[PDB]
Write a protein that holds these residues in place. Structure first.
Motif, PDB file in Angstrom:
ATOM      1  N   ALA A 238       0.842  -1.189   0.000  1.00  0.00           N
ATOM      2  CA  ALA A 238       0.000   0.000   0.000  1.00  0.00           C
ATOM      3  C   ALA A 238       0.880   1.242   0.000  1.00  0.00           C
ATOM      4  N   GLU A 239       1.939   1.196   0.799  1.00  0.00           N
ATOM      5  CA  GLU A 239       2.910   2.281   0.868  1.00  0.00           C
ATOM      6  C   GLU A 239       3.505   2.573  -0.511  1.00  0.00           C
ATOM      7  N   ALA A 240       3.800   1.521  -1.270  1.00  0.00           N
ATOM      8  CA  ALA A 240       4.382   1.681  -2.596  1.00  0.00           C
ATOM      9  C   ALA A 240       3.315   1.968  -3.646  1.00  0.00           C
ATOM     10  N   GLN A 241       2.062   2.010  -3.206  1.00  0.00           N
ATOM     11  CA  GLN A 241       0.936   2.366  -4.066  1.00  0.00           C
ATOM     12  C   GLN A 241       0.691   1.376  -5.207  1.00  0.00           C
ATOM     13  N   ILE A 242       0.926   0.101  -4.931  1.00  0.00           N
ATOM     14  CA  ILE A 242       0.501  -0.954  -5.836  1.00  0.00           C
ATOM     15  C   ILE A 242      -1.012  -1.076  -5.699  1.00  0.00           C
ATOM     16  N   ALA A 243      -1.705  -1.272  -6.820  1.00  0.00           N
ATOM     17  CA  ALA A 243      -3.164  -1.281  -6.831  1.00  0.00           C
ATOM     18  C   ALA A 243      -3.746  -2.626  -7.266  1.00  0.00           C
TER      19      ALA A 243
ATOM     20  N   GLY B  83      -5.509  -5.388  -9.398  1.00  0.00           N
ATOM     21  CA  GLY B  83      -5.534  -5.536 -10.843  1.00  0.00           C
ATOM     22  C   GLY B  83      -4.153  -5.421 -11.466  1.00  0.00           C
ATOM     23  N   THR B  84      -3.202  -4.881 -10.711  1.00  0.00           N
ATOM     24  CA  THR B  84      -1.837  -4.755 -11.213  1.00  0.00           C
ATOM     25  C   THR B  84      -1.164  -6.123 -11.330  1.00  0.00           C
ATOM     26  N   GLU B  85      -0.424  -6.338 -12.412  1.00  0.00           N
ATOM     27  CA  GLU B  85       0.326  -7.580 -12.555  1.00  0.00           C
ATOM     28  C   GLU B  85       1.788  -7.351 -12.220  1.00  0.00           C
ATOM     29  N   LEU B  86       2.351  -8.216 -11.386  1.00  0.00           N
ATOM     30  CA  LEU B  86       3.783  -8.156 -11.118  1.00  0.00           C
ATOM     31  C   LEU B  86       4.524  -8.846 -12.252  1.00  0.00           C
ATOM     32  N   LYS B  87       5.479  -8.142 -12.843  1.00  0.00           N
ATOM     33  CA  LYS B  87       6.173  -8.648 -14.012  1.00  0.00           C
ATOM     34  C   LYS B  87       7.533  -9.182 -13.615  1.00  0.00           C
ATOM     35  N   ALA B  88       8.153  -8.542 -12.628  1.00  0.00           N
ATOM     36  CA  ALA B  88       9.495  -8.920 -12.219  1.00  0.00           C
ATOM     37  C   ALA B  88       9.798  -8.462 -10.803  1.00  0.00           C
ATOM     38  N   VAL B  89      10.736  -9.145 -10.160  1.00  0.00           N
ATOM     39  CA  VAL B  89      11.227  -8.735  -8.858  1.00  0.00           C
ATOM     40  C   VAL B  89      12.732  -8.570  -8.978  1.00  0.00           C
ATOM     41  N   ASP B  90      13.217  -7.351  -8.754  1.00  0.00           N
ATOM     42  CA  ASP B  90      14.636  -7.038  -8.904  1.00  0.00           C
ATOM     43  C   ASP B  90      15.218  -7.578 -10.209  1.00  0.00           C
TER      44      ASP B  90
ATOM     45  N   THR C 270      13.256  -3.915  -2.150  1.00  0.00           N
ATOM     46  CA  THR C 270      13.233  -4.671  -3.383  1.00  0.00           C
ATOM     47  C   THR C 270      12.502  -3.840  -4.416  1.00  0.00           C
ATOM     48  N   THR C 271      12.884  -4.000  -5.672  1.00  0.00           N
ATOM     49  CA  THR C 271      12.215  -3.266  -6.731  1.00  0.00           C
ATOM     50  C   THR C 271      11.349  -4.200  -7.552  1.00  0.00           C
ATOM     51  N   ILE C 272      10.056  -3.936  -7.579  1.00  0.00           N
ATOM     52  CA  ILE C 272       9.141  -4.761  -8.355  1.00  0.00           C
ATOM     53  C   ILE C 272       8.697  -4.024  -9.610  1.00  0.00           C
ATOM     54  N   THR C 273       8.710  -4.718 -10.739  1.00  0.00           N
ATOM     55  CA  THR C 273       8.230  -4.136 -11.976  1.00  0.00           C
ATOM     56  C   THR C 273       6.772  -4.519 -12.100  1.00  0.00           C
ATOM     57  N   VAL C 274       5.907  -3.538 -12.311  1.00  0.00           N
ATOM     58  CA  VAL C 274       4.481  -3.823 -12.378  1.00  0.00           C
ATOM     59  C   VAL C 274       3.855  -3.260 -13.639  1.00  0.00           C
TER      60      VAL C 274
ATOM     61  N   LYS D 276       9.587   0.755  -5.632  1.00  0.00           N
ATOM     62  CA  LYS D 276      10.420   0.236  -4.554  1.00  0.00           C
ATOM     63  C   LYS D 276       9.556  -0.161  -3.375  1.00  0.00           C
ATOM     64  N   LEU D 277       9.816  -1.344  -2.832  1.00  0.00           N
ATOM     65  CA  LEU D 277       9.198  -1.749  -1.583  1.00  0.00           C
ATOM     66  C   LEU D 277      10.217  -1.616  -0.465  1.00  0.00           C
ATOM     67  N   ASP D 278       9.810  -0.975   0.621  1.00  0.00           N
ATOM     68  CA  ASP D 278      10.666  -0.830   1.793  1.00  0.00           C
ATOM     69  C   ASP D 278      10.512  -2.066   2.673  1.00  0.00           C
TER      70      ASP D 278
END
Length: 94
Positions: free
Chosen positions: A16-21, A23-30, A53-57, A69-71
């Motif tokens: 929530a902090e990183a404002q992921i919503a 319906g969003t698809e995670l494409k990659a992690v780092d 960690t950095t997630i590509t969405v 970025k996720l803290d």
């Protein structure tokens, strides 16, 4: 069928902090592409002991990818009994 699509986001969570919503698809992690939620989990486990960690969405309905970025400074879950994704505030669809 099993793409890592966000179903729900828990209020005040890391995600929530990183404002992921929803319906969003995670494409990659780092920088490692993650085809399903298990792949996402396997990458997240490797981030245990990292500060972030950095997630590509790709937000719902869009092809446009972006990094967030996720803290993880205060991140904690029981790796053997809990879902890393849930601990970030994410409920997988559906």
């Amino acid at each position: 069928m099993v793409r890592p699509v966000v179903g729900e986001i828990a209020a005040n969570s890391i995600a929530a902090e990183a404002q992921i919503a929803p319906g969003t698809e995670l494409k990659a992690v780092d920088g490692i592409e993650t085809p399903d939620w298990d792949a996402v989990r396997l990458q997240l486990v490797d981030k245990i002991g990292d500060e972030s960690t950095t997630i590509t969405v790709a937000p719902f309905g869009s092809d446009q990818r972006r990094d967030v970025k996720l803290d993880l400074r205060h991140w904690a879950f029981e790796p053997d009994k809990e879902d890393p994704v849930s601990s970030l505030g994410i409920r997988p669809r559906g």
